[PDB]
Symmetry: C3
Subunit: 555 residues, 3 copies
Amino acid sequence: QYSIEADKKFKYSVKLSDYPTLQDAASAAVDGLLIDRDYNFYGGETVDFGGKVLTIECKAKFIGDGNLIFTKLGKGSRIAGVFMESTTTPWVIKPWTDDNQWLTDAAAVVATLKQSKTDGYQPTVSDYVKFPGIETLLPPNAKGQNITSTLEIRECIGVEVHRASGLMAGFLFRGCHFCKMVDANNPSGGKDGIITFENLSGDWGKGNYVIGGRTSYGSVSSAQFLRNNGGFERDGGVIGFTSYRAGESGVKTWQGTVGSTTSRNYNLQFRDSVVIYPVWDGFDLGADTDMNPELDRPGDYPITQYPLHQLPLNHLIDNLLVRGALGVGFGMDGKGMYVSNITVEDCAGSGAYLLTHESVFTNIAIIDTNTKDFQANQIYISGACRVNGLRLIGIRSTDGQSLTIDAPNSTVSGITGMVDPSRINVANLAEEGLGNIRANSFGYDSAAIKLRIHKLSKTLDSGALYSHINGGAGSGSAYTQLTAISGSTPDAVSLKVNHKDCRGAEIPFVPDIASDDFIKDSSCFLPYWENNSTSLKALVKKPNGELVRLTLATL
Amino acid sequence: QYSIEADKKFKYSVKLSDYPTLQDAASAAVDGLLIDRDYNFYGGETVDFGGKVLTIECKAKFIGDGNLIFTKLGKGSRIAGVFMESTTTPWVIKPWTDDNQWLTDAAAVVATLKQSKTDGYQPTVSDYVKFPGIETLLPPNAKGQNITSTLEIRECIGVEVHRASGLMAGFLFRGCHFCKMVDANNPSGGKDGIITFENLSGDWGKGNYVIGGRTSYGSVSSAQFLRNNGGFERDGGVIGFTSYRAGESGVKTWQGTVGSTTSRNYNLQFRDSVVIYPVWDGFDLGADTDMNPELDRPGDYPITQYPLHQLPLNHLIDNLLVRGALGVGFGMDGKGMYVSNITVEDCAGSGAYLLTHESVFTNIAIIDTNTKDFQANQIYISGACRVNGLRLIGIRSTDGQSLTIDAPNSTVSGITGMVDPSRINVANLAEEGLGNIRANSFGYDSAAIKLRIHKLSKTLDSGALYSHINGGAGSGSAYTQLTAISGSTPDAVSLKVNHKDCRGAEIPFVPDIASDDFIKDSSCFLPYWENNSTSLKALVKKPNGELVRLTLATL
Amino acid sequence: QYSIEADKKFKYSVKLSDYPTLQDAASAAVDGLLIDRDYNFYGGETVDFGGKVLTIECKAKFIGDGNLIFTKLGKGSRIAGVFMESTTTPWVIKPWTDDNQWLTDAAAVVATLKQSKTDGYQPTVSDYVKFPGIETLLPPNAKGQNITSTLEIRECIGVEVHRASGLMAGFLFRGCHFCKMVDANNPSGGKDGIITFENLSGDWGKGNYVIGGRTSYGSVSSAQFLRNNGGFERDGGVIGFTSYRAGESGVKTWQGTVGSTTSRNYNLQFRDSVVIYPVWDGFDLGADTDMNPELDRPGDYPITQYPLHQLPLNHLIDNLLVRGALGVGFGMDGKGMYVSNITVEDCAGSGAYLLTHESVFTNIAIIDTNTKDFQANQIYISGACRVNGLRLIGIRSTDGQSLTIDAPNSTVSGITGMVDPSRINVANLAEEGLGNIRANSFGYDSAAIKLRIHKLSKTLDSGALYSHINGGAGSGSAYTQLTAISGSTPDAVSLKVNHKDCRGAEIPFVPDIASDDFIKDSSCFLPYWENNSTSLKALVKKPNGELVRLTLATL
Ligand SMILES: [Ca+2]
């Protein structure tokens, strides 16, 4: 009859409007589950999906503070359009102005307090460091808040959450594998991380990705990983993602011990992603603790095997953009890392903080960072690394004495930009492979090729090759000049060719009687002045190496 | 009974084959709506979706000239697989050859006329400027055509159109917010823009994106925005998109006044996108009118607050590719802009047209543009900007006198390429932070480090440091030479070291009696020729600064 | 009654659990088809979908060796979540260690043999070349295996396969157009290519894409094309894709003749993609055969029209990353190509192999490749090409005499990195457009600007401009030195300014009687030593060009 036919020809879906609880709907479901009414959940409410492969389509809100916990979803299950919202409207800070300047003054930040589920974030203890003095100034009702509405996927394999959004919203994958957060539809975050893959118990996380989408706000980091290892296959990480205004960092791999084990991460991808206006860092890809580090690594490689900041993290890191960080645009540690195509621009905080060793950085741009001067540098590298291509300086000036690059053990090539050379500190800087060269000078009456020996002086050029106009701009004539520093006066001693279009070489001479050791090489002469006879003499080192003094020019 | 059970266990969807009109189907719908028969609509036909959150799945065509208007869709509604097609087959031009060379001659373009819904576009008034003389030569039936089949989403929030396609097809989001055009499946455009977010009435547009996908053809721009502001969160714009053969521009933010208000745009993202073969521009990210601009900005910041081309547009612009533009590959205006990782190559038109001020450009490549010589330059910058990394010149030659870069108020570093230095015009050019250098010469008997003072001459080097082979290639010997220009003859005066492997310095002398003012510095001497005695003399400036003339070399 | 109402209000879907065969379910389907039980298929089993536009949702496996063939799907059909798995568990090799070093020794590779559907690949004949001697050492049961479970879409238009996965899995689009493989969910490959668009019969393939997703393993290439042409619109190719551990190459356009016709490809996009750890190549974008090429091109342009490797392939190639290739990171051929933003790093094999002609390469980075020294170079270019921006050398050393870049007909600008200049071979190298320059020296007592004439010597600098510290580091004094090579001894002859802070120029003289031809220019003098009188003489070329010998300095 009809019922036999109908059962064969129609798509199966249950809808939440037909059930008193979410578990009742889950139990009834076979293929589809439609969330077609707002659902108020209690923190810790747990739904058992019976191992079923379900296509969950959300067209309403899950409303609650705390965690709505999904369990026992079958591999291939998908959850689309989820919207999490807290019941509580907390107090939030908004540490930026109507012209999008960061507020750094604690009292100014306190003045921004409002009750809202968005457009700011709940203070946490990290704000006490970020805005010194704010701990004392914040009213009690703005401290210690803990509002998040979290969808928790617990101990599932092969589950994807697509187009998720919300207000004071979080997404937690706890003990999951081969799960993805795809095309996040700009959830506005709460107290906890917005997207978290946490694998502190069970097998190391693997196959876990953030792909596409974006998030805004949140008190802490937007996308974060604990105890994930993508394997040599690099099966996990963050690709195609945007984070705006993280209360901590945009993308974070955790460092150090959490609970009783390692929170660290290996072999993940961080590519094609953007972090804008994080309160702390753009990308924080470190694994070992920075300040006050642990002396051990329970559940990970021991310090005896790999010293602090020298783990073989092996992440695949490429094509990242940060703008507007208040902390550090791009931070990492590790040994033997390859990093490419990183652009950090227009940051109040520093551009890069790299606790790396035997690592290679290719095509890095650090442009107008440390704009507030809270840090000692714009890019720092601790260990012995190679930088191949480094763009420095946009349009911002720097007032004080802070370095631009401090990479004292690194070998660097390919700096471009209007960098102040006194603010470069590297182990070695070289352009070994340039072709024939031309120095083109605009807005000056001369062109210059200068030399600076940083061991002698970081602030003064030690010699130069100049070309200078003779006469007016239409003269068709210039003089070439070779100079050397003396008494810390650049260009103090020089030889000239064609000064005043004279077609001759002007040769400097020793202004008094030359000592024997003033001459360096054999078969050379050094002119010197004999004032008592109004004569030039020549100190000559003969071809055989012996010295003789001759008369060179006389009245 | 069964009907109670069936109502609970089956997915709800209505299909258009069961209804005489689209409104009848819309009214019946609860969850799904399937378009399973072709639907002929009349221009302006308007469907009211009752605030319902609908999943609209299209497996057939909407056929009609003019606009099919969708209204009152609930937040979270999705429309997938839509296919728009005109009833009319218009006359189109195809201004490119079978070898994909652009046709620029009006008569050649007229000769391409055919009736088709694709593989070309309907002429509009901008073609009269693009192909001078074409207005007179086009037959009347090819002028003033207005064929588009447009899906209009009107005054909706949170609606996504996914995998849309069509023929003579357009997509209009009018007065919408938080709407997206996702993975456009290469619709072939009509007369109007292919994808438009227009917010001239109501609140400024926000949350509106083109994400992924591609388009082809169209008479005007492929993706365009009017009166959208993404906020500091940068919630809107174009990410991951490809435009082919736009009749105007690939991606356009409108400029100036439209109707009675501003059409301008702020705080949008333009990233990870590609524009190929636009008739006009690749990316046109300007906000103020170029030619014959308005004297005011109704509905926007007044000219008194921000002068023309100096709006704080604040777009996030990164990782863009243009190839094959007939107009300008990359155009913008604004003040305080940051722009990075832009590649423009193989363009008949110019590469970049930048009416920007106090802006920063990082890692720009402009490669083989202005190949037809319709423009004065390959990259132009009007205002006082910084360029950090600029690649110029691929393999194409330039015949005439056009500049490569004309950026007269800009400070530039990091030019690479076989640029003709006479075709560089900047305020300042500098490599402040190079390491130890080597000039490697291939295919010559010498290596060179040249100096050019553009104030003196843009075409002639003013001095040089050379190394030149002595003897044959296996000699193990070279001479080093320091030269200076005189009488507009490069290398006219020089000093040599080791010419003919002689192990000595060849020193130029003044060819006649040296004037007092020919010598520059104290404790120096200048040799000069006394022909009447066959002697070298020395003009000596003593250590005390006084002059004396001495005999230097005699018979 | 109810049945009339039910037929109108419910979504149509059939499910495989209600049918004995896949064809029975296909025949019954109208809108949806759900794969809700594992289905064992026989090789060549063919399903006719009746031209219907079906949404096929897979929540179970297709299990079988050989091909499951889908035919007569309507335009707009979609297949999601498909999982292919072989019945056979073959023998696989795993030629890498637990520290992810490549195994190159045949006996070591044989020792890795295990029976598994993943974590390795079935040997094919290309392994006999890749691991010399392995053909003899492999047991017979590991040779000639042919296990793949392949979903074949045959002669369909407008079909998309989304989120596909599997074990020993392949995906074949045979004679298709406007089809896409979207967001591949890391299928683990078998013997055949993982994703193939093959159009050897019928019209040239067009509209065929791999978009997003990733694959792992496989015996041969991950994504590959035969006889596709995207048109000027560039409607096809690979965008946003990742390949891990291809048994051959990550992304491959086929070369030469297959069957009786061309397998070549034109006008495709290769962008925003990543290939890691391929056994052969990252990207192989060649069209003509490398070793032992055909003398003809049946079905393509004849050799008389375009010589070997000089086809107008016209692909759009941009923003590619390769790491860990054992073969070549990036290979191509063709004439008139534009290529940009390619990064190849940390490869055992060479970085780039470019059989290109009149082509332009912009912003290329080749970093730590040829690390095993199996190849003669890190980047090779055969023809007359332009390279604008080339980063060379990360942190790896090279022991032997292999070149870094061998591009003997190419003109290059913008090399950065710690390249050994003796390992650069180009037609011309030049930095024509640098600004005012500073050479900053760190870790030395001197700074240097060196010149090297490769025709004279590739290994020895021919001259230099130095600045050297006088005294200790706090002296405030340096000497400038201009040097020239003699007798293959760099810096053999020099002029100094300010040696020992003497404020004078030390001038080299000819150590014996100067021959007439030692002097070059008129109005110059050359000092020389007359030992028989303990005198300096001057060989003078007078302003009139005649020679005279004068006494310069005397006892
Ligand atoms: Ca004398």
